[PDB]
Each structure stands twice: as structure tokens, then as C-alpha cells.
């Protein structure tokens, strides 16, 4: 992270799309370097749905400028996540902040 910043880094990181943003709240059922499985809370469950959300993370993909694009999990198994929370950090991102 930048020690001295302006407070805009979160907006850029979230709106760039490089990060994995939780579509629905819940608790992370499983964490892996390539997959994050989230068990959705029973208030956002549409009837008939499985109840889980799967986020596959890009790992070492060439960018347009021959640069690594890598998504790194920043979550543990079992902790609660809400909507809009960052689950994985993309390139030049640290805990949801532009870095």
C-alpha cells in the first residue's frame, strides 16, 4: 500500500474489475489460490438456488503489455463477508487498495 495516499485507491481498485468482489454476502466456505467458494446467507437466497457462489481467480495471464495478471486471495476460511467486499486482489492491489 501507499503510506501516504488520497483515499481514492479503494474506488479505483473496486471499479477497475481486477479484484474479485463478493456478489452476495455470506461466509467463505473454502479458500484456494485458484477458487473461492462462498456460502451465501439465507437472506439473499433466491428460492431453489444451491446457496453457494464460486469465484475462479485469474492466475498468471499475459496482459496486453506482456505483464502478469494474477489474482491473489485475501480471505480466510470461515470469516464473514458482505456485499462489495474484496475476496481477491488483482495486479497492483493490496487488500482492496490500489498499490
Amino acid at each position: 500500500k501507499p503510506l501516504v495516499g488520497t483515499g481514492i485507491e479503494r474506488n479505483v481498485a473496486v471499479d477497475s474489475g481486477v479484484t474479485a468482489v463478493a456478489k452476495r454476502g455470506g461466509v467463505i466456505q473454502s479458500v484456494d489460490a485458484s477458487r473461492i467458494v462462498v456460502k451465501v446467507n439465507e437472506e439473499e437466497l433466491i428460492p431453489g438456488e444451491a446457496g453457494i457462489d464460486i469465484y475462479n481467480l485469474t492466475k498468471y495471464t499475459r496482459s496486453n503489455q506482456n505483464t502478469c495478471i494474477n489474482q491473489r486471495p485475501c480471505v480466510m476460511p470461515g470469516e464473514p463477508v458482505a456485499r462489495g467486499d474484496v475476496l481477491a486482489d488483482g495486479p497492483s492491489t493490496d487488500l482492496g487498495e490500489l498499490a
Partner: peptide, 9 residues
Amino acid sequence: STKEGVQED
């Protein structure tokens, strides 16, 4: 590369 069940690359 990654490994199954391993959080870190």
C-alpha cells in the same frame, strides 16, 4: 503455479 488446498502460490 498453484496447488490444491494451498492458499499461497
